[PDB]
Scaffold this active site. Sequence first.
Site, PDB file in Angstrom:
ATOM      1  N   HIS G  91       5.905  22.882  -9.376  1.00  0.00           N
ATOM      2  CA  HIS G  91       5.673  23.165  -7.961  1.00  0.00           C
ATOM      3  C   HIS G  91       6.993  23.178  -7.190  1.00  0.00           C
ATOM      4  CE1 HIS G  91       1.370  22.571  -8.684  1.00  0.00           C
ATOM      5  NE2 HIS G  91       1.672  21.429  -9.275  1.00  0.00           N
ATOM      6  N   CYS G 133      12.400  24.279  -8.790  1.00  0.00           N
ATOM      7  CA  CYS G 133      13.251  24.125  -7.605  1.00  0.00           C
ATOM      8  C   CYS G 133      13.689  22.674  -7.410  1.00  0.00           C
ATOM      9  CB  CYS G 133      12.519  24.617  -6.353  1.00  0.00           C
ATOM     10  SG  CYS G 133      13.243  26.098  -5.610  1.00  0.00           S
TER      11      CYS G 133
END
Lengths: 86, 93, 92, 133, 134, 133, 133
Positions: G91, G133
Amino acid sequence: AGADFLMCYSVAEGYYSHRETVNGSWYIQDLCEMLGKYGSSLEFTELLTLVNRKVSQRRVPSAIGKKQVPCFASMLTKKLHFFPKS
Amino acid sequence: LPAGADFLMCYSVAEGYYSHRETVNGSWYIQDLCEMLGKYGSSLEFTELLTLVNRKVSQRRVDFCKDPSAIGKKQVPCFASMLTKKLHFFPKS
Amino acid sequence: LPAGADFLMCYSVAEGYYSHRETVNGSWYIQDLCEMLGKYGSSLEFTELLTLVNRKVSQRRVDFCKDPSAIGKKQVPCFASMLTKKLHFFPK
Amino acid sequence: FDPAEKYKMDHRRRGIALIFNHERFFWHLTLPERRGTCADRDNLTRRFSDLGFEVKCFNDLKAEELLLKIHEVSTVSHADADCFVCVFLSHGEGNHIYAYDAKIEIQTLTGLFKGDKCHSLVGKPKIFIIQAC
Amino acid sequence: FDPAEKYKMDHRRRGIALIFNHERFFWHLTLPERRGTCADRDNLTRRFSDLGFEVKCFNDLKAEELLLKIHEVSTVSHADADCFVCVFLSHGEGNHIYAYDAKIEIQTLTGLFKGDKCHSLVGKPKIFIIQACR
Amino acid sequence: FDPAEKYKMDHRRRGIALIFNHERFFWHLTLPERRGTCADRDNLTRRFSDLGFEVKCFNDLKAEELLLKIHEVSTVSHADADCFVCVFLSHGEGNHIYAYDAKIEIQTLTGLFKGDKCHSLVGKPKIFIIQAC
Amino acid sequence: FDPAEKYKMDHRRRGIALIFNHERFFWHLTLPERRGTCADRDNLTRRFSDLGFEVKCFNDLKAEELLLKIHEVSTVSHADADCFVCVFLSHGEGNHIYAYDAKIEIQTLTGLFKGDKCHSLVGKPKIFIIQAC
């Protein structure tokens, strides 16, 4: 990094780059060989992929199991050709 | 046109099309063939190169103002392949 | 054999060669053509594909020991291009 | 000037893939020929459909609906089409009337689009696949 | 089986690039026609030479050296050559005799290589470039 | 949407091919290394020239000339150029200082252009060939 | 020598296509984030399976059945396989410990083949698709 960047690396991580000889280095020799023959026609990442093979198959100090493995990173959005200019 | 295997027959003009007359510079078909040979011959595949020659020549027009005799007509070349593989003329080592 | 601009004439057998008789599977030229359309039709430039068919078909052999009268015979196809560009059939 | 230039194949449709069978004036037609013809038409039909073509099939058995089919293809529009394919399939070792009829049919089929006599195909690939003797 | 297979072009020589100029039975040769024919030959001679070909030029004016040339090309071995190229060149606006004689020459030149009659060229490209007009 | 779309390489010039040699802080430069480095620069200069590039070479030995050379390249408009090429060349076996200076130099050379600072190269290939260790 | 040389892809199987979801140490999972991850997993599963791959999916939530899975794939023979694919999915805007665990998982996943200590995949393409990320 950047959009439409192409990063061509002579040696990747965890791999050994060969010594500079009198006739130049393996990476540039092979890169330049491919440019000479295939530069005007082939798509440049296909050409870079050839250099990956050519340098990885090269062989020369009891560290034997050893090759230089180059790498390229593409942020290109299209095919790249260097067709002869008018 | 009896042609055997591994033949490549290249024609300056197909049937029902016109050939532009010989000038001081030569002929359209040979000029373009040669321009393409000199520019791409050592790199491109030969049937691809001849397809460029088909285009270049077939796009050639003449000043219809000076000569409205030859108007609505073009030279459309052609080639016939019985090749079984790609053909390249890379510089010989 | 009058053609025209942007024509591509694909022939099953060049003049001076032999065409293998139809079997239950079809004909040599159409089988091979279709095989190559199945595998490379979506990606290859079509004349390069046709060149493969010239190779596959021209290399087909019968069992010459069973039928020695067929010895010397082969099927060599041909194609004639008046195309002015490369031709691809990329998925739409 | 682009040496890698390609025909623009971005129209709404690929186009018609015409499959023609030369059947009339053939009076032998063995078991292999019979089923081999069906296998070729089927094989061709599947491969061209997978490339986006709109496959159309007919033969020269009924002269009435021959001319109507010939006329429809002569007049139908290709303006939303990429290319045009036509496949001419004829038997082997047919009689002399069968072979001569084939040459006339091939010239006529190719003549419908010859020079640039069909306007909605001007500058578009016209592909003729021919099997004959 | 391989869709990108290429002809083997790594033999010692490229091969013969034969350039034939159809000249006999052609009268009223204009100045542009004369220098254009020379322009086509020279241009062809340069471009093929630079691709490794051994260019051979001849014409049909003499007839003595024509037969001497035709039999020479018949008996040439291409065992160490990559391929063979033959350019047939002729003028437009030829008379009836000229055009007809062209077809005979074209049939003959290519007749010498049809159905694999030259064993040292088997499996090797045989390129014929023909400029003719009836 | 073309799956075989190419960059538009139809400008007046191909562009600059920048051949940079990292020399400073390298002690005990062997003759063979001096020959090899020359061989690489020469070979790269020949091959890129034949591909249409205006090749420009320079090194970092002289402090002042370096600042002038980087300034020169920073204010070049690439409006009529197909692409940009920069080759960073550095010796194989060199001291910790040499290897550190290389890293800082590579980020500086790629830091220019990057993101999209050099607006005349926006949408154009930017090619960095990097030989460091 | 050939510039069109392709990897050998005529083995019995296409090979395993590993799809890894990084989930553990993510504490506030919203509706779009939940469904999006499912949508991505399903979409990837469909596309790779139609390409002949054998799709194996798992996550890192239950640590007991994870360790077994790593061993499950580490001991596999890819001798009858064309290539190997591994997709890592995590995520965005995750917490501090979530991002760190991602890096360690990626280095571990890749390391299982990166030393060339998976002998049966030697000379065969190893594809890693990474979302983080």
